[PDB]
């Protein structure tokens, strides 16, 4: 069984809300907190991307999506 | 026999110039051993257990909250405190509430609010870990001769023998009655790895729930729930199951996060079961690597006369075992004890008997007998017992038989791991090469990537191969293609 | 006068019909106030204080320990625990320790050990923070006219007048007897910012220390020592001031890091002193902005008769004041009251008077009088009072006075900061420009570099100037040179 | 535990002060103390700079900065 | 065997028939000695001490002040004086104060002022240095044979023997009872360097501090505090802890910089502890190079019969020592004086005995016995003691065994320095090469860089490497690159 | 007063040391503790060196020195 959650646009007024009813604050604090768990995972992915991608602009930019997804798998 | 009754059956074969055979008994499996002249035996492992294993961490799955207290202070008049902040078993929180002139403060701006609540696990809502002790494991192994009587998986057979093994046990000798003796020895220290295993238990009074689970040890220590060891009244991290609402001017509310039991049961997907019998704790998976020595085995009834051919009848007609062999039972009306003459003829080849009997020299005796099991070559066959006959067609062909054996071989390898090379005492040099290569490759993959999930294992393998196709050097391209493809070859067997 | 008794003076003068002057009084400074044809005043700030200020953090500078306990467990039987882990005023630590059969253990390996001790501050070694309330600060400002009497620094003068200001006092009117009334208006919101301020108090019993220090608000909240607020019996963070050794198999040692007082007293560096008098807490460094109204001053003695020129005597001969003025005192034996004839002559032209008298219309009264203060041109002069004459030589040169006044100006600017533009202010446009420029540049340096240390600021200023020398664009090179020069002006230009 | 040095643009206010701060005129005494206490080493920094740096102005500035920084880390 | 009770241990083997071994005994460590056909002996260093050592400088940590005076003179009156200015036991300071008519001077300007205060240390606030005398230092070394008994870490083993060494002695023979005689030679040269160590004592009576610290000799003379030698009535440099306020007109304030104890206790971070017990001053660090001669030891009990194989029982099960050896204890009921026939066998091979017994010829005796220690090869094994057996697994690998010995070699080499080459009497040419090279290369870094901080050493090593990359001459480039690498090795080997 | 910190080399041995001291095993944690509070601190030090300095080896060593000195800047 599953009972998946919902967000963003059931948005109530300025009243009280249930525990931690947020997504961006949670994802940012999760992403910045995860870095301590394993340096070699992101460092080796960064090193491979820095060697494999041609042109500095895409070489810098492409990594952001992978790091935004990373804590969903670790 | 037990080997008629369970679907995981396998056959070990040889010649008596080697008297020692290596077996890998798997719990819930069965093995048959056969050789030139010596009788065949059924062998299995019946239970791995301990009495009163060592207790470890207890966890709380449903909080009971009681006796909550609240206090607050005016904006400049210092932070609040309560005596309950310095007692056992109590969860506390501190926050900057709003205050204002209408709520009896002398000033606008932030004040202080503090709240305490007392905590316990609810009765019978515990979860408990247990761990096995290496010096106290008992492994039980059983042997019976292929007697030629038949008994269902219901009554108890009289010819069966049982032996228990512990870290302090020898090359034991089992006296198989009339059939002489068999010798049995165990690598007790090299079965299941007790560094990996915890046995998890909920309360014993539930109906549909399994009695216990074989959870992994590292997983059991990362559980984000309140805990203690035995005899303590305080709970560590009791704040895991309680959270507090954003303050009102002179109140803050505690919220119970509720009974977690379903989240635990939904987390233990794909983890094997275990069971409990008052004080025994049994596993229901795992294996032992073991030696049987055939030195002292004896044949029975070789001096008896042959049956008078007209006095036989079928009692259970020739039928398919589901495991290649054919099985039958006969009733006989002459004098006893005596030898049953058995043969099979391939159609168009009357000069040669093709029956491979799985039981040597079948005999009737005064109390019983008359079960026979045999293997036949594929196609049209005729089976004879005295002057009775029955016609038969044996399914499949030699190529399909080699494939069927190959499938069971891969199923052994993919569940036993590196131990799979011990099955049968084969001295051929290639066994050492295969053993080494699997040990090296399995050790490398497990130490580099072992705990990673199924999807990220696939995504890593595919990404390295695709980068390999994009590389500007052919040697580095081949290295990325090889290292990406190997991960997929090591992992694609799971499912969807 | 008190201006005669102090190391520092500044002079202000109003042109005829000027009703108001703006002053920025500093504690321990004084101002001489004048206007054309009106009597002169001394004005000074006398105290800045409160009765029984509000408390904040208490800190412990020296720990006392009692009643320590220890417990330990073998490598199998889980974590050790003690009752005192769950009580107030305790410090506890838990760690692994080495164990084996030699210590009466079951098995060799890492065990666990736990330790507890009671904590308290040594009886007089507390440090207390106090904070002022803007609703209760009292500022004291005092005025005396130049009556022509003289009174020592350890004597009280009957002509001295006193006023006190809070958030709840308007434009005050002070009466000076025959000289009429003077009007005075404070702006208490312009004083030293309470949000930057705390008062730090140690044990008042020490014969050889200051009683309090004017510590900065942020620094006092970042202190690492153990702490509490008032009325609580327990100490927060008590584990900051004790530490525990490496364990032995059955015991572990607790050590006390000792009295921190010398660390605190060295860490305070250049911070201003403060003092205590029973219930009263005084600052001894700070400033106030105020308006003085020359609205209702009377020149005393314009109706009095002029003295007989012959009956004067010197009571105290002419001397250099050290503020570039001449001071003298005369005694007179004729009828009283009467008005003193005074002039000074350039030694070569007897027709011209050069005496700039700072006490207009000087007189002898029945009870006392006859002090004079004057300023003269550089070089030779003759000074006359009645028919008495004396010969004098005023030191220095006209260039010397503008240099000395320029020095006083710059020294005031680097202590008052952006408020220095209000002193003796008039509606000329430059008063807006100077205050705007200091608001902009001061805001930039305080927000960009305000927390950076003195030698680090010099290293940053040198590095920024060196980037200005090395970089490739001439406009940006000059911008880096100028901005590096500002950081050096805010350090080596403050002192070297 | 450490206590940070307070010294900054303080609540200056022109009155009496506790003991005045270790500015440049005091800091040079720490340099002289280290030059005396560590005497045998002091030639090494000068000798290396004299071999390695071209131009007398940057050579002197590098030596002056090195000797000024040394007693803050030694 | 005390070496079972300790977490640092080492093993030495005499090469066949060699009479002498060289041991670098290291304080709180232990060594187990072995040779062909001879009993095994444990040797360790128990204390380094002296009675009533030589007393050097004393320092004052907390000044106490009395009898303050001040005197001042009017401007141009000529400088002030007080009787105390010439005396011992007082601090005096002289300065200029501003004066004028408001405070009873004749002329305005700079006057002169002088102030005096008497100085003492508070009654128990001293710090005292002590120094060792080469003519009086005593070393205690202890020896016990492996008797095959076991005795707790808190019980008096009767087989233990002790020898005391001083520079007035060198050699001793210890009788071991039945095991014969053992010979020991010590030198007080190549001990801990008495010329570079000082023992620092505070108040001995504080319950929660170490009694003493092993400070370096240069340190205790580079300090800046008030100081004296023994018996003197007045302190040198008392101006180090008293400082004075800027003058008022006719007063100066005297201030006390307070108790320095916490500043000193912070500054000694990383120095090893020492202890004072009665009149004795023990060190708790150090090493001694000793020579052990094994000519006259005897194997006890080679003449006895073997036990009845049926009568053995376990008293402790086979258990891992943590030093990569197996230990066990056995109980028996036959006629007591007989040999125990211990052996072990590797799985997959015949009964070639793989057990290297570290205690040779184990027996029971009428008084006790029955403890054994052995070493085994990696993997699956079985150990036998008459009819008793136990299965076993030994951890690790043949490569891991070499790496583990390599680490302990590197630990000794860095901790003991140049003396580490003297371990083991096989004095081949590489041992003399190592001794020479370590004397030269270590002497260079310890004399050139020794006193510099850990970070600025690393920054210098980096700078010499950075410059080495930029040099145009290849010989100078390689020399600079090597020198940077050497400074990094000389630091980072001690960095963790 | 200014009692210095005792040197880390002298009187090395196996006995109890009084407190943990200040070798690189400690200092590396102090550098990370400065950075994870002052999250932007390394950005300019890495970026300006990567833009301005030729040769990877001297560029990397300059970045390493600029970060190793960091907790002494205030
Ligand atoms: C999920 C709960 C399964 C319970 C069960 O019934 O588990 C049994 C035992 O699973 C296992 O040994 C799987 C062990 C995996 C590690 C299902 O396989 P099986 O009854 O054929 O016994 C095992 C027959 N092998 C050994 C030929 C598969
Ligand atoms: C299919 C059933 C066996 C799965 C299995 O053996 O899967 C893995 C892979 O093991 C191997 O030797 C792979 C050898 C490859 C060569 C081990 O188990 P696991 O870590 O995934 O699960 C926890 C452990 N249990 C399943 C025993 C409870
Ligand atoms: C140039 C000297 C001008 C007169 C003077 O000495 O000007 C100084 C003012 O400029 C300085 O300090 C900076 C002088 C830099 C040279 C003292 O002027 P003041 O005593 O009237 O202070 C109040 C004067 N505000 C209202 C204009 C600030
Ligand atoms: C560039 C920033 C100039 C700020 C400024 O002109 O600030 C001036 C000092 O300017 C200079 O000496 C340099 C002027 C030339 C540039 C006033 O601030 P202060 O720190 O000297 O005042 C004392 C500190 N209280 C206000 C917090 C007590
Ligand atoms: C295990 C293999 C040797 C490990 C080791 O590095 O051992 C080292 C020696 O070898 C090395 O390469 C040292 C390289 C660094 C210098 C320590 O030898 P040791 O602990 O026996 O000290 C006594 C050694 N004498 C018998 C030769 C005196
Ligand atoms: C881990 C580091 C092992 C090497 C080591 O520790 O090497 C150092 C320096 O390298 C060498 O001697 C290398 C050449 C050897 C021939 C050994 O001598 P040391 O500098 O520690 O001085 C003596 C020891 N005290 C500091 C404890 C007194």
Residue numbers in the entry:
A (entry chain F), D (entry chain D), F (entry chain E): 1 to 74
B (entry chain C), C (entry chain A), E (entry chain B): 1 to 496
Question: What did the publication describing this PDB structure actually write?
Answer:
The E protein is a class II fusion protein and the largest of the structural proteins. It is the main protein responsible for receptor binding and fusion, as well as the major target for neutralizing antibodies. The prM protein is a precursor that is cleaved by the host cell protease furin into mature M protein and a pr peptide.
Langat virus (LGTV) is a tick isolate with naturally low pathogenicity in mice. We determined the structures of LGTV and chimeric LGTVT:prME using cryogenic electron microscopy (cryo-EM) and three-dimensional image reconstruction. The electron micrographs of virus preparations contained mainly intact spherical virions with a size of ~50 nm in diameter, along with some broken particles. We generated a 3.22 Å resolution map of LGTVT:prME and a 3.82 Å resolution map of LGTV. We compared both atomic models to the previously published model of TBEV isolate Kuutsalo-14 (25). Both structures are consistent with those of TBEV, with the root mean square deviation (RMSD) of Cα atoms across protein chains below 0.7 Å for the E proteins and below 1.5 Å for the M proteins. The main complex-type glycan was biantennary digalactosylated with core fucosylation, including GlcNAc with core fucosylation, whereas the LGTV and LGTVT:prME resolve only the innermost GlcNAc of the N-linked glycan at position N154.
